[PDB]
Amino acid sequence: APDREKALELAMAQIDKNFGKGSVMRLGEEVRQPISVIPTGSISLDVALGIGGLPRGRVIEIYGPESSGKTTVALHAVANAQAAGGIAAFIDAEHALDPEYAKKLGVDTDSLLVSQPDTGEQALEIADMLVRSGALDIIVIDSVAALVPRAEIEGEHVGLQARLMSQALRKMTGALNNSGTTAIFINELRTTTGGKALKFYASVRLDVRRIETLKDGTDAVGNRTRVKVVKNKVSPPFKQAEFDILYGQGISREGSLIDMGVEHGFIRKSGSWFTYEGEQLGQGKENARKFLLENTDVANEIEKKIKEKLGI
C-alpha cells in the first residue's frame, strides 16, 4: 500500500498547514511564492534569498563581525523601500549611522525617521509603536547588543536582556505581518544576548562576513563580502552570495554584473581577461568594472541577460 512520495507530500502539506508555509522544504525546490520583497542591494544576495530580496512583513537578522558590510546592506534595503514610495524608520542605539554615506547609497535621509532610545525597552516599544501604525515599509534596529535593559542602565543581577528581546519580538511579529513592515535587526558579533530569541523569530538570518580586500594589484579599492542565508523560511536556505563594496561606495552593481555574468557564462574570463560577446572588457576585475562603469549600455544588456535568465 505504501507509496513514499505520496505519503511524504501529504505529511509535508499538513506540516505547512499546521505551522505555516515553508515549515518544511526540499533544498532543491524551485519556489514559486512571489511574495513582496525589498531588494537587498545585491543581485546575487536577492537570488540567494530565492525571492528577490528581503521578505515584507517579517523579522530579518543580519549578523556578523564589525566592518562586514552589514549596515551597508541595511542601508540599500532602506533606499530601495523608499524608492518604491515606502517610509523608513531607524531605531539607533549605536550612534554610528553616517547619513552622508547613506545618501550615497540612495537613501532619502531627510525623510528617514530616526530614534535614539534611552533603554532597550524603550527602543523596542518605540519600534513596536511605529510598526503597528502600518505606515512603514521597513524599520532597522541598529544593534541587538545595544538594546541593554533599563535596570542595567541604572546600576542594578539576572538574564533580563534576552527576555527583553523575546517578549518584544513576541508582541511585534504580529504587527509586522499585519502591517507588512520588514524589520531588520543588525547584530554585531562576538548570540548577542537577545540574539537567542531572534534566532527563532526571524524568517531570514544573514551571516555576513568580510572575506577579501579588493586590489587590482598593489593598493586597495575596497573589500569583498560573503553572505550566507543560514535561515530562510520563505525559500530554501543555506544559499550564499558575494559582492564588492568599494571604499566610500556601496555595493558595486558592475561588480555583481561581472561575477554573475561569469558563472552564468554570459561573460567569458579567459585567464586574466574578461570578454563579453566579442568585445574585451579588460584584464582584471577592476578594469572590467571600470569598463562597465563607462559603457553603461553594455552593463544594462548584461544585467538584462542575467535578469532574464533568472528573473528580473
Report the alpha-carbon distance of residue 228 to residue 237 in Å, rounded. 9
> Should residue 50 be labelled a site residue for ligand DTP when binding is judged by CB under 6 A?
no
Strands in the chain per DSSP E: 37-38, 54-55, 59-64, 88-92, 113-115, 138-142, 182-188, 204-214, 222-232, 240-246, 268-270, 273-276, 279-283
Q: Which does 39 bind (CB under 5 to 8 A by kind): Cl ion, ligand DTP, none?
A: Cl ion
Report the alpha-carbon distance of residue 175 to residue 135 in Å, rounded. 11
User: Given candidates 98, 118, 277, 301, which one binds Cl ion under the rule CB under 5 A?
Assistant: 118
- Among residue numbers 185 through 244, which ones bind ligand DTP (CB under 6 A)? 188, 223
> Should residue 98 be labelled a site residue for ligand DTP when binding is judged by CB under 6 A?
yes
Instruction: Please answer whether residues 182 and 127 qualify as being in contact, where contact means their C-beta atoms are separated by less than 8 angstroms.
Output: no
With a CB cutoff of 8 Å and minimum separation 6, the contacts of 80 are 38, 39, 40, 41, 53, 106
> Should residue 248 be labelled a site residue for ligand DTP when binding is judged by CB under 6 A?
yes
Q: CB of residue 223 vs ligand DTP: minimum separation in angstroms? A: 4
> Should residue 247 be labelled a site residue for ligand DTP when binding is judged by CB under 6 A?
yes
> Should residue 273 be labelled a site residue for ligand DTP when binding is judged by CB under 6 A?
no
> Should residue 277 be labelled a site residue for ligand DTP when binding is judged by CB under 6 A?
no
Report the alpha-carbon distance of residue 259 to residue 243 in Å, rounded. 8
Site mask for ligand DTP (CB under 6 A), range 148-177, x = bound: ------------------------------
Interface with Cl ion: number of residues (CB under 5 A): 3
Residue ranges in contact with ligand DTP by CB under 6 A:
64, 66-72, 96, 98, 101, 188, 223, 245, 247-248
